[PDB]
């Protein structure tokens, strides 16, 4: 479970390097479950990008590093389109 | 030298029309009347989709950083490097 700064986050390049190799390398072998906050800002964006390019560069490899995000229902921008009374399949 | 010499022959025959030369006039007439009124083949040079080329270049720039670590790591195993360390 990775946590960090959401809206006001700044990082040196050396810190950026560990997310690309250290977090992804230790996530991809063991078959982990990266759980984090669901947001497009800050550190969660860094985890979201650094897990995406692995799936492209995997060259049709089996399995994907599964990622589950948890955020509050209140602070969502366009959630009025999400509420469907029937099963929004 | 031969493997380098291999290419241009395949080029010249790829560009050539298909007829044996007693019938190559049948090819010359259609091309001469098409260039009378008003481009490589798309198997040796093609302008890709922009949206495709972005994905291809991102894949490339991913793979470069994977090359560089092995390069510098095996460069750390020369003996002169060990003596310096």
UniProtKB/Swiss-Prot annotation, chain A:
Tissue: Highly expressed in brain and peripheral blood cells, such as neutrophils. Also detected in bone marrow, spleen, heart, liver and lung. Isoform 2 is found in neutrophil granulocytes.
Top-rank taxon: Eukaryota
Location(s), subcellular: Cell membrane; Perikaryon; Cell projection; Cytoplasmic vesicle
Binding residues for ADP-D-ribose 1: 3, 8
Family: Belongs to the transient receptor (TC 1.A.4) family. LTrpC subfamily. TRPM2 sub-subfamily.
Domain notes: Contains two binding sites for ADP-ribose, one in the N-terminal part of the channel and the other in the C-terminal nudix hydrolase domain. Both sites seem to have a role in channel opening, but the interaction of ADP-ribose with the N-terminal site is absolutely required for channel activation.
Known partners and oligomeric status: Homotetramer. Isoform 1 can interact with isoform 3. This interaction decreases Ca(2+) influx through isoform 1 and suppresses susceptibility to oxidative stress-induced cell death.
Protein name listed in UniProt: Transient receptor potential cation channel subfamily M member 2
Organism annotation: Homo sapiens
UniProt gene name: TRPM2
UniProtKB/Swiss-Prot annotation, chain B:
Source species, domain of life: Eukaryota
Annotated intramembrane regions: 19-37
Tissue: Highly expressed in brain and peripheral blood cells, such as neutrophils. Also detected in bone marrow, spleen, heart, liver and lung. Isoform 2 is found in neutrophil granulocytes.
Location of this chain's protein in the cell: Cell membrane; Perikaryon; Cell projection; Cytoplasmic vesicle
Domain notes: Contains two binding sites for ADP-ribose, one in the N-terminal part of the channel and the other in the C-terminal nudix hydrolase domain. Both sites seem to have a role in channel opening, but the interaction of ADP-ribose with the N-terminal site is absolutely required for channel activation.
Record text on subunit structure and interactions: Homotetramer. Isoform 1 can interact with isoform 3. This interaction decreases Ca(2+) influx through isoform 1 and suppresses susceptibility to oxidative stress-induced cell death.
The protein's name: Transient receptor potential cation channel subfamily M member 2
Portion of the full sequence shown: 1062 to 1150 of 1503
